[PDB]
Amino acid sequence: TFRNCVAVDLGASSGRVMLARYERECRSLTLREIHRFNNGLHSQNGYVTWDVDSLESAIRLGLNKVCAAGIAIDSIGIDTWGVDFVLLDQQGQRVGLPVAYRDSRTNGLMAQAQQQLGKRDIYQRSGIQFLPFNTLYQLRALTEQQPELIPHIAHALLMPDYFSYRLTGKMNWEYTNATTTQLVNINSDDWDESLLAWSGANKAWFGRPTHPGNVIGHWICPQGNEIPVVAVASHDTASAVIASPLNGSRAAYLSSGTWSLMGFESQTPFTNDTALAANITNEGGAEGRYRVLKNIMGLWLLQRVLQERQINDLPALIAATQALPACRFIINPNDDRFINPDEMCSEIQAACREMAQPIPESDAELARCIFDSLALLYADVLHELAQLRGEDFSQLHIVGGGCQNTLLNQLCADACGIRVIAGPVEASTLGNIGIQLMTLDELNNVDDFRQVVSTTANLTTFTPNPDSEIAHYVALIHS
Ligand SMILES: Nc1ncnc2c1ncn2[C@@H]1O[C@H](COP(=O)(O)OP(=O)(O)O)[C@@H](O)[C@H]1O
Ligand SMILES: OC[C@@H]1O[C@@](O)(CO)[C@H](O)[C@H]1O
Numbered sequence: 001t002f003r004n005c006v007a008v009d010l011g012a013s014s015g016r017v018m019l020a021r022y023e024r025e026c027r028s029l030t031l032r033e034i035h036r037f038n039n040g041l042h043s044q045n046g047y048v049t050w051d052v053d054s055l056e057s058a059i060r061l062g063l064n065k066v067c068a069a070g071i072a073i074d075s076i077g078i079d080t081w082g083v084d085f086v087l088l089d090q091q092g093q094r095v096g097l098p099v100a101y102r103d104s105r106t107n108g109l110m111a112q113a114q115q116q117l118g119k120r121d122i123y124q125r126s127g128i129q130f131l132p133f134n135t136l137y138q139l140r141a142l143t144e145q146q147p148e149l150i151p152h153i154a155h156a157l158l159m160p161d162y163f164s165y166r167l168t169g170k171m172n173w174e175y176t177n178a179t180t181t182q183l184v185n186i187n188s189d190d191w192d193e194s195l196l197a198w199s200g201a202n203k204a205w206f207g208r209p210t211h212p213g214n215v216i217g218h219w220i221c222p223q224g225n226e227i228p229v230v231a232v233a234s235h236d237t238a239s240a241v242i243a244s245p246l247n248g249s250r251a252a253y254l255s256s257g258t259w260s261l262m263g264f265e266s267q268t269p270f271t272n273d274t275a276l277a278a279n280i281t282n283e284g285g286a287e288g289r290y291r292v293l294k295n296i297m298g299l300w301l302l303q304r305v306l307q308e309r310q311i312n313d314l315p316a317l318i319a320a321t322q323a324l325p326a327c328r329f330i331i332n333p334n335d336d337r338f339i340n341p342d343e344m345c346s347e348i349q350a351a352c353r354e355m356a357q358p359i360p361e362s363d364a365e366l367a368r369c370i371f372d373s374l375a376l377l378y379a380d381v382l383h384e385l386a387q388l389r390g391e392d393f394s395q396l397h398i399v400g401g402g403c404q405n406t407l408l409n410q411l412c413a414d415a416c417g418i419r420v421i422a423g424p425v426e427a428s429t430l431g432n433i434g435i436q437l438m439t440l441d442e443l444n445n446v447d448d449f450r451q452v453v454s455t456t457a458n459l460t461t462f463t464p465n466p467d468s469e470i471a472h473y474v475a476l477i478h479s
Contacts, residue, residue, distance in 0.1 A: 001023055001025075002021055002022060002023040002026075003021070003022050003023065003074040003075075003437065003440055003442050004019060004020070004021055004066075004071050004072055004073050004074055005019070005020050005022070005073070005074055005075045005076075005077070005433050005436040005437060005440070006018070006019055006020075006034070006062075006063065006066060006073055006075070006076045006077070007020065007077055007078075007079070007232075007428075007429045007430075007432035007433050007436075008059050008062070008063075008076065008077070008078040008079070008163065008432075009078075009079050009080075009236065009239070009426070009428045009429045009432055010039060010055060010059075010078070010079070010080040010081070010159070010160075010163075010236075011039060011080075011081060011236060011257055011258060011428075012039065012040070012041075012081050012257075012258040012300075013039060013040065013257070013258050013303060014036065014037070014038060014039050015036075015037050015038070015039045015055060015058060015059075016033060016035070016036050016037070016426075016429065017033075017034045017035040017036075017058075017059060017061075017062025017063065017065075017066075018031055018032065018033050018034060018426070018429045018433075019031075019032045019033075019034050019066060019071070020032070020429075020430075020433040022433075022437060022442060023442070024442055024443075027452060027455070028456070029430075029433070029452050029453070029456045031426060031429065031430070031433075034062045034065050034066055035058065035061055035062030035065060037055075037058040039055065041100055041102055044097060045097070047097055047099055047103055047105070048099070048100045048102050048103040048104075048340070049097050049098055049099055049100055049103075050084070050098045050099075050100050050159075051098075052086065052094075052098045052162070055163070056163060056166055059078075059163060059167075063076070063167075063219065063221075064221070064222065067221030067222065067223070068222075073221075073227045074227075074228075074436075074440055075227065075228050075229070075230050075436040075439065075440060076167070076219055076227055076228070076229045076230065076436075077229070077230045077231070077232035077234075077432045077433070077435060077436045078160045078163050078164050078229075078232070078234060078432070079160055079232055079233070079234050079235065079236045079238075079239045079428055079429075079431070079432045080159040080160045080163070080177075080234065080235075080236055081101075081159065081235075081236055081258075082158075082177055082180030082235045082236070082237065082283075083101045083131075083133060083134060083135050083138070083158075083180050083181065084098070084099075084100065084101055084135075084138075084158065084159050085135060085138070085156050085157065085158050085159065085162070085181075086098050086156075086157055086159065086162040087149070087153050087155070087156055087205075088153070088154060088155040088156075088157065088165075089152050089153065089154055090154045092165075095149055095152045095153050096142070096146065096149050099138070099142075101133040101138070102133070102339065102340045103133075104340070105138075105141040105142075105145060106132055106133055106137040106138055106140075106141050107132070109132070109137040109140050109141060110130060110131075110132045110134070110137050112140075113136065113137065113140070113198060114130070116198065117194065117195075117198055119276070120276070121194075122136075122182070122195065123271060123275075123276050124271055125185050125186065125192050125194070125195060126182045126183070126184065126185070126186060126192065126195065127186040127269045127270075127271045127275075127281070127282035127290075128179065128180070128181075128182040128281050128282065128283070129279045129280060129281035129294065129295065130182075130279055131182075131295060132336065132339070133339075134180075134181065134182040135158075135180070135181035135182060135183055135199075136181060136182040136183050136195055136198075136199050137182075137199075139156075139183075139199035139200060139201040140198065140199050140200060142200075143199065143200030143201065144200070150200075153202070153205060154205070155171060155205055155206075156201065156205040156206055157171060157172075157173070158173070158174070158177050158178065158180075158181070158234070159177075160174060160177060160232075160234035160235075161173060161174055161177075161216075161231075161234065164216045164217075164229055164231065164234075165216075167217070167219040167229055168216050168217025168218060168219060168229050169217060170216050170217035171207065172207075172210065172214075172216045172231050173206055173207045173208070173209050173210065174209070174210065174212065174231045174232075174233075174234040174235075175189065175209040175210060175211045175212065175284050176212060176233040176234060176235045176238035176283070176284040176285060176286065177233075177234045177235035177238065177284075178206075178209040178284065179209075179235075179282075179283050179284035180235055180283060180284075182195065183195050183196060183199065183201075184209060184284075186269055186271070186282065189209060190208055190209060191203055191206055191209075209284075210231065211286075211288075212231055212232055212233045212234070212286050212435050213230070213231065213435060213438060213439050214230070214231050214439075215228045215229065215230055215231075215439065216229045216230070216231050217229050228439075230435060230436045230439045232431070232432045232434075232435040232436060233285065233286045233431060233432075233435055235283065235284070236255075236428045237255050237259075237261045237283065237291065237293075237428075238283065238284065238285055238286065238291065238431070239427070239428040239429075239430075239431030239432045239434075239435075240253075240255040240261075240399050240400060240427035240428045240431055241253055241255065241263075241265065241285060241291050241427075241431065242285075242286055242430075242431030242434050242435070242446055242449065242450075243399065243424060243427040243428070243429075243430035243431035243434060243449070243450070243453055244397045244399050244427060244450070244453075245397060245421070245423075245424075245450050245451075245453045245454035245457065245459065246265065246397060246450055247394070247395060249391070250391060250392060250393050250394040250395075251264070251393065251394060251395050251396075251397060252264050252382060252385065252393040252395070252396045252397065252418075253293075253396070253397045253398075253399065254378065254396060254397065254398045254399070254402075254412070255399055255400050255427065255428075256298065256299065256398055256399065256400040256401070256402025256403055256405075256408075257298065257299065257400040257401050257402055258298055258299060258300045258303065259295055259296065259297070259298040259300065260295075260296035260297070260298035260299070260374065260378070260402065261291075261293050261294075261295060261296070262293055262294055262296060262378060262381045262382065262385070263280075263281075263291055263292050263293025263294065263385060264292055264293075264385060264389065264393070265285065265289045265290065265291060265292070266282075266289065266290045266292050266389070267288065267289060267290070268290070269282035269290050269292070270282060270292055270388055270389070274387075274388050275388060278294070278384045278388065279294065280292060280293070280294055280384070280385070280388065281293055281294065281295070286435065286446055287445065287446055289446070292385065292388075292389075293385075294381045294384070294385070295334075296333065296334060296374065296377055296378065296381060297333035297334050297335075297338050297339075297374075298333070298374070298402070299370075299374075299401075299402050299405075300338075301333055301338060301344060301348070301370045301374075302367060302370050302371075304344035304345075305344055305345055305348070305363075305366045305367065305370065308343070308344055308345050309345065309363050309366070311363055317363055317364065317367055318367070318405060318406075318407050320363070320364045320367075321364045321367040321368050321371065321407060322407050323364070324364050324365065324368045325469065326368070326372055326411070326468075326469035326470045326473065327372050327376075327469060327470055327473040328357070328358055328368075329348075329352050329357060329358065329359075329360040329365065329368060329369035329372065329373070330352075330355070330357065330369070330372060330373050330376060331348055331351040331352060331369060331373045332351075332373065332377070333370070333373050333374055333377060334377065335351070337351065345366060348360065348366060348369055348370070349361070352369065371405075371407060371408050371411055372411065372470065374408065374411075374412075375408065375411035375412050375414070375415040375416075375470055376415055376470070376473075376474070378412045378415060378416055379412075379415040379416045379417075379474055382396070382416050382418065393418060394418075394419070395418065395419045395420070395421055396412065396413070396416060396418050396419065396420050396421070397420075397421050397422075398412065398420055398421070398422045398423075399422075399423065399424060399425075399427035400425070400427055400428070401425060403422040403423060403424075403425060404422075404425060406422075406460075406462075409422045409460070409462045410462050410465070410468075411470055412462075413462040413463065413464040413465070414464055414465045414468040414469075414470045414471045414474075415470045415471065415473075415474050416464065417464050417466070417471065417474070418464055419461065419462070419463060419464060420461070420462035420464070421459055421460070421461055421462075422459065422460040422461075422462065423457050423458050423459040423460060424453060424457035424458070424459075425458075430453060430457075431449075434446070434449040437449070
């Protein structure tokens with residue numbers, strides 16, 4: 001009577017196959033990691049790409065581990081990073097390369113679109129923030145730079161639907177992730193004609209976006225039995241918001257991983273002048289609850305400093321960084337220069353040096369710079385979001401792998417002057433499981449699920465410290 005649901009959660013920095021156990025009467029939700037594997041950017045033939053074949057094999061591995069365990073699997077669901085896509089021919093074979101959002105092929109194309117179509121217009125249609133790597137500009141890059149592929153393309157599937165197709169044989173176009181493309185019209189919940197036209201993409205490459213909960217198809221363990229594959233809120237960030245234990249209207253979330261996604265939930269989008277000027281997005285959510293958020297470059301900066309400096313002990317680095325004075329090195333992480341520079345440490349140091357600031361040179365200094373610069377931006381965005389909706393936030397829920405960074409959790413509380421609740425760590429996985437359970441009729445809605453999470457997950461509270469270094473700094477920048 002307990003249900004066994006599998007989440008496949010693929011991030012930019014890592015992928016995971018996880019198993020969850022749940023039953024209504026007990027209200028208990030347990031997560032088990034089945035298969036953890038690495039994901040990252042591969043330089044392939046002058047492009048920055050994803051190794052989709054290795055991921056699928058890794059996904060199959062994880063699933064086959066659950067079948068051979070002799071576990072009755074009630075459902076499977078896949079969530080990944082947004083924006084990206086895979087092209088398929090008439091037979092199902094991939095067309096072209098699976099290009100990552102970190103690729104430079106889109107450079108300049110966003111500016112061209114705002115010039116040709118109008119900044120206001122694209123925003124009124126999509127309600128999606130302008131990011132230079134949006135699918136709208138990715139498809140322009142493809143149609144302009146590779147026009148010999150066009151005739152072969154029959155279908156375009158976003159990453160999670162691609163992997164759902166590979167397991168089932170059935171194509172899906174999941175709503176919450178479809179919205180990350182800047183190609184869906186916010187008033188119709190279907191693909192925008194004019195935006196598709198500018199991108200050069202064909203409307204027939206896509207089906208009508210469908211809201212989370214439908215069964216895409218089925219997957220077969222090496223013995224026979226059918227396991228339903230559910231279209232979850234397939235955008236990883238959409239899943240993480242679902243699993244965030246939000247306490248009604250005045251709670252904000254920060255989905256913290258490679259990216260920091262800061263926002264709130266609304267039943268109505270914000271597409272006015274204030275939202276455009278602040279560059280807010282209205283990404284699709286479960287239940288039609290718009291995820292009104294902003295992208296913050298996030299721990300991507302730390303990830304890159306780790307590799308380049310050859311640091312294999314992150315907790316040790318964080319512990320040392322805590323001994324260093326706050327807010328002496330400040331950059332703007334959302335600067336385009338940080339999207340994918342060759343030398344991250346040099347970029348961060350160059351940016352500091354340009355502002356006549358002392359140069360962060362040690363490992364701890366570079367981490368200090370990153371954590372402090374993020375926390376100040378967290379503060380800025382939170383003010384921007386509260387000012388937009390005309391309402392304060394009582395608490396900030398930090399979820400994701402980044403929520404294990406207790407230093408950054410406290411810095412964020414202190415800079416934002418707000419109570420921080422950290423947890424759950426694997427929010428995307430949990431939200432993925434959450435939707436499956438509703439499809440199985442084990443769970444009634446998202447509010448139902450968030451109560452399970454808030455009485456199941458480990459939640460750590462961070463109280464904002466007014467006499468903190470970063471708090472001192474933030475009060476100073478007011479007058
Ligand atoms: N033990 C830890 N302490 C502090 N931070 C951590 C720890 N483990 C992971 N992180 C942070 O979490 C990030 C990855 O989080 P995750 O939500 O998995 O991101 P993504 O889904 O983008 O891969 C890492 O960049 C790292 O900074
Ligand atoms: O797709 C690129 C970025 O990756 C995320 O999905 C988080 O992993 C963000 O929501 C999206 O803006």
